[PDB]
Amino acid sequence: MVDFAFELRKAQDTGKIVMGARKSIQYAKMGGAKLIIVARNARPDIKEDIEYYARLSGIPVYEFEGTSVELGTLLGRPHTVSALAVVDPGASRILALGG
C-alpha cells in the first residue's frame, strides 16, 4: 500500500514540493504541479479554489485525513500547512494517491 506519510516525506527529500495555500494555488493555476494535497481543515474557499484550478489543468487533488497541524509536523515544520503541491515526486510513489 502507498503510505502517505512516508511517500510525502520521500517526495519532499528526493523531488520538489511547494508548501502553503498561496504557492499551491499558484502552481495549480499555472499547471505546474502533479498533485495538490490539502489538509482536511483547509479553509473552505481555499479548498474550493485549489479543486477548481486543479480541475482546469487535470491535476489530481488529495485530501489528507489530518489537520494542518499534523500536515505541518509531517513536513518537518513547527507551523500549520493547509496545502502543498508536489512539483516533482522524486523517487516517491506519492502520485499514486491521485488515482
From Swiss-Prot:
* GO function term, MF aspect, one: RNA binding
* Alphabetized UniProt keyword annotations: Ribonucleoprotein, Ribosomal protein
One Pfam family named in its UniProt record = Ribosomal_L7Ae
Gene Ontology cellular component list = cytosolic large ribosomal subunit
GO BP terms: namely: translation
Chaperone as UniProt keyword: no
InterPro entries associated with the record: Ribosomal_eL30, Ribosomal_eL30-like, Ribosomal_eL30-like_sf, Ribosomal_eL30_CS, Ribosomal_eL8/eL30/eS12/Gad45
UniProt record similarity statement: Belongs to the eukaryotic ribosomal protein eL30 family.
This chain's protein is named Large ribosomal subunit protein eL30
